[PDB]
Structure 1
Amino acid sequence: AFSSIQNVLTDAPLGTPSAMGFLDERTEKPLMGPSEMDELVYAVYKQVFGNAHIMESERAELRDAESLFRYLRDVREFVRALAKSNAYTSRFLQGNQQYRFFELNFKHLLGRGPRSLEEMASHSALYAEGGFEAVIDAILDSDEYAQEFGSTVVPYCRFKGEYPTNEEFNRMLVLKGANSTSDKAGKGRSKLCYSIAAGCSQNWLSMSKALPFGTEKGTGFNLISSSRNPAARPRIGTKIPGGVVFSS
């Protein structure tokens, strides 16, 4: 839980001023005003849609969820209203596979990649009982969304240091790309799909393109193979005074 990259080599996460405006008697929030309000909206449009670069006549159908975001200043409600939009399902649901849609919900709304096939198959168990809005509100009303973001900050891609699987950091680095990438370049097909269902891992150059500036992006590659052999049993022995003991 130290995480040497997070507030050092990246920026600080954006969001509303505090969470004490909810308990105020005569306001709803420290009111930003329309110069420090709309530049928070620029970071929700950049995070939920990828870098999709929505036009003026595509932003004109999100006027109702913005106008509510400047009254209730809840960030979880703005993200929930933008994921049930037509502009979220015409980019990430319409021309994609099912595990491509699921792996972008972990990117746009959690800042991590899915850790398992069992965690991924339960997201398709919620598709059968309520469609795509049952997937979206179960991510948003989870415990993992509460104790990292709350109503206060935008859901950003967080370098934690103490990931519950090491593979979770790998799929986070493939999903989040470099700056000036987007989520439409692969033609519908899921990047992480072979590695979730088999249990293998990712490619080192695809992860190190997305690391921040100052992290030795790519060195350490020996010129032999990049993954491990599960069938190999090596002999690793330790020297004692007399000989060498192979505690295998």
Structure 2
Amino acid sequence: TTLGPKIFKLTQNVGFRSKGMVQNAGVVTVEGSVQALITAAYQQIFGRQLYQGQRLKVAEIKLENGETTVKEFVRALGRSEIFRKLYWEPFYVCKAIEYIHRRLLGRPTYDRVENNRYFDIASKKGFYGVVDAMLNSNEYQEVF
């Protein structure tokens, strides 16, 4: 509805579709709807855009070329370098987890059962381990 925030879904082919248009056509309208999806990924995962060195290209290049989905572009961003750094590293371990959950699955944790699942996965596997559960849950897939 209009009572909540917009949801961006990349339906626009992308895929580097091609056509029956001039071979080196200058304008290709929808090759710019992907681009707004790309910036909107950043705006959920980190909350703002990154600075120049920081952006992760070569993840975008592939999304834009149609080789990987939206789902996997989020995974690359989630398991990235600055994401770790900004949000994992400087905080107490469970503060890191609670905050990371809001960014990757849009809501706060409900429980201690849930919180603990990750707290005891982070102690064996690290940042990487924790990220990969939020990303691999059943709930991620049903919802997103």
Same fold (TM > 0.5): yes
TM-score (norm 1): 0.49
**Which of residues 36, 39, 48 is equivalent to 1:39?**
36
Corresponding residue number in structure 2 for 1:66: 60
Contact 1:28-1:72 at 8 Å conserved across structures: yes
Structure with higher helix content: 2
Contact 1:103-1:114 at 8 Å conserved across structures: yes
- The question of 1:86 aligning with 2:104 is answered no
Number of matched pairs: 133
1:100-123 alpha-carbon deviations (Å, 9 max, x no partner) = 211122111110110112211110
Q: Residue 72 of structure 1: CA displacement? A: 2.4
Q: Residue 44 of structure 1: CA displacement? A: 0.2
- Provide the rounded CA distance (Å) in 2 between the counterparts of 1:80 and 1:57: 20
1:9-45 alpha-carbon deviations (Å, 9 max, x no partner) = 2343111117xx7xxxxx9697884311110001101
Which amino acid is the alignment partner of residue 41 of structure 1?
I
5+ long unaligned stretches in structure 2: 19-28
The structure-2 alpha-carbon separation of the partners of 1:13 and 1:126, relative to structure 1 and needing over 3 Å to count, comes to same
Alignment RMSD (CA, Å): 2.3
- Provide the rounded CA distance (Å) in 2 between the counterparts of 1:99 and 1:129: 14
Corresponding residue number in structure 2 for 1:57: 53
Contact 1:139-1:145 at 8 Å conserved across structures: yes
1:103-182 matches, within 5 Å, as: 103-149=98-144
Q: Residue 73 of structure 1: CA displacement? A: 4.3
Contact 2:84-2:127 at 8 Å conserved across structures: no
- Provide the rounded CA distance (Å) in 2 between the counterparts of 1:133 and 1:29: 32
**Which of residues 10, 13, 27 is equivalent to 2:4?**
10
5+ long unaligned stretches in structure 1: 1-6, 22-26, 150-248
1:171-210 matches, within 5 Å, as: none
The structure-2 alpha-carbon separation of the partners of 1:119 and 1:41, relative to structure 1 and needing over 3 Å to count, comes to same
Contact 1:49-1:108 at 8 Å conserved across structures: yes
- Provide the rounded CA distance (Å) in 2 between the counterparts of 1:30 and 1:104: 38
Corresponding residue number in structure 2 for 1:102: 97
- The question of 1:48 aligning with 2:42 is answered no
